Design a protein around this nucleic acid. Structure first.
Lengths: 130, 123, 81
RNA sequence: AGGAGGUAAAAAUGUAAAAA
RNA sequence: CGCUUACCACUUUGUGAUUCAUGACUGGGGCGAAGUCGUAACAAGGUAACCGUAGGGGAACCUGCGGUUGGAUCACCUCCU
RNA sequence: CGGCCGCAAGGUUAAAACUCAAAUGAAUUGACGGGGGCCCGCACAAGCGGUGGAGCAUGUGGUUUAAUUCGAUGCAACGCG
RNA sequence: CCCGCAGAAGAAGCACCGGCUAACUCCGUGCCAGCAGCCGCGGUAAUACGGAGGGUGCAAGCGUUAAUCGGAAUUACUGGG
């Protein structure tokens, strides 16, 4: 019902390095406007939903579950900062989706036409000794 | 017909398919026996059949039938298997020998007790 | 990063041996998912939103109290997605 | 009684609303 | 006796043949019908059907060409002699 | 699948696993046919007056109720028992 | 192997009973639980599920499984289309 964004201030490690690709001398030098976060598995906010992120095979997440997302879209670092915070809630909150199994099924009116069908063959099979 | 055709190509003996490919000329076989579940029979009948999936000694995963009320198998317990189809659940063609290593006899079978492997109550 | 808290026991119209409860529409969960809640056609939900819950298999009173409430929150999480 | 012509138009399904 | 030479087995290398296991995924089949879509075929099945071939199409199938009968149907109204 | 042939479509040769207790032919009694022939009925046509729209009486379904007794509930139940 | 003691003492179960295939009723469960080589039995009277009584077969053996030939003139030379 009630749900509110948490994003533990400080619990999420944030690093900053230079970008890739082409783009003059502003992308190889002071291009440290690019991010690369670190969300260890030791964080554990929900605790039990947490173990489902770890055993969950996926990219942008190592074997130890450090969760590393390298943001590279624009020059502004505050843009990739929010662009990353969005890719986390897009990865994290996309795996929270605990789809319902809710099974199985069962015949409702099979016996209402099948059983009457056989009962109609059970009466025809009387051809034998008089 | 027409003998010359016959001397070139003789009368073909129909190589019949053996109904139970557990192991040819083999009366019984044992298995690890896993997967105990229940599925529905076909159009004529209407019930819930207790079946099992056995890993054979020669390595053949086949499904068998536990004939009787007595359920004495859970994901393990090695049992004995004999041939016999039940024809209602398509896919199964073997009977679990009731009175095996870990499969005991069914209770209150005071008539026809050789089958279901129950010994005689002296009283 | 999106702390979940589905707090039950609030604006309820739980009527009832085997429960037949309703759910009030004029409150609980706002317009973005409320319209998603008011746009479901499965004939369990009426044309108002006073949803006619017909939970009858969970025999006992207090059990069907929460089971129909379970029928409520399950229908809610499906329609709040 | 032989004979030749012409005379005609679209329309499914049989759990079919009753379960989760 | 030692040594030497020819031959052969194990071992070795390279390259083929065949067979048997296995392989993400993928093709089609059988079976389970208790669902969804349509109703193609069986009456002239509501466009006769089927066969081969080519193209088309969510599905049965549709269409062109040629072929087979394993297809039904001859009621009446005008008129000559 | 392999071989064979082919510009390609594909053709020819020809499996098995698995699955079912059936599938098939001719003919018979029926039944049905938006098959044909013939015939009848307030079936249609030619007419007249009604129901359905309104109010009320009465029966039923649904709903409600502590109970609203039960059964009938296409034609052939519903001013029925 | 023979003589002697010898209290019946110490010595009978198994399958099946709807038809095929010799042999029947009652009770409990209700297309549920289950049976079966084949057709199939079972929705509150189950001659077929379980049990009980009685019956039939065979016997220190009796069943079930597996396998071969037979039935199968369903590889037909004898003996087919």
């Amino acid at each position: 019902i009630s749900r509110h964004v948490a994003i533990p201030d400080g619990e999420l490690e944030i690093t900053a390095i230079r970008a890739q690709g082409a783009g003059g001398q502003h992308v190889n030098k002071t291009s440290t406007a690019i991010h690369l976060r670190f969300d260890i598995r030791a964080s554990s906010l929900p605790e039990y939903y947490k173990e489902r992120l770890l055993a969950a095979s996926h990219h942008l997440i190592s074997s130890d579950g450090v969760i590393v997302i390298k943001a590279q879209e624009y020059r502004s670092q505050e843009l990739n900062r929010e662009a990353a915070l969005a890719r986390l809630v897009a990865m994290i909150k996309e795996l929270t989706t605990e789809k319902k199994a809710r099974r199985p099924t069962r015949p409702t009116r099979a016996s209402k036409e099948r059983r009457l069908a056989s009962k109609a063959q059970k009466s025809s099979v009387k051809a034998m000794r008089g | 017909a027409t003998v010359n055709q016959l001397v070139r190509k003789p009368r073909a003996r129909k190589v019949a398919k053996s109904n139970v490919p557990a192991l040819e000329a083999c009366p019984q076989k044992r298995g690890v026996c896993t997967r105990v579940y229940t599925t529905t029979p076909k159009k004529p009948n209407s019930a819930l059949r207790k079946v099992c999936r056995v890993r054979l000694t020669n390595g053949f995963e086949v499904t068998s039938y536990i004939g009787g009320e007595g359920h004495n198998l859970q994901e393990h317990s090695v049992i004995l298997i004999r041939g016999g189809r039940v024809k209602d659940l398509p896919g199964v063609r073997y009977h679990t020998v009731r009175g095996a290593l870990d499969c005991s006899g069914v209770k209150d079978r005071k008539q026809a007790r050789s089958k279901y492997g129950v010994k005689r109550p002296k009283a």
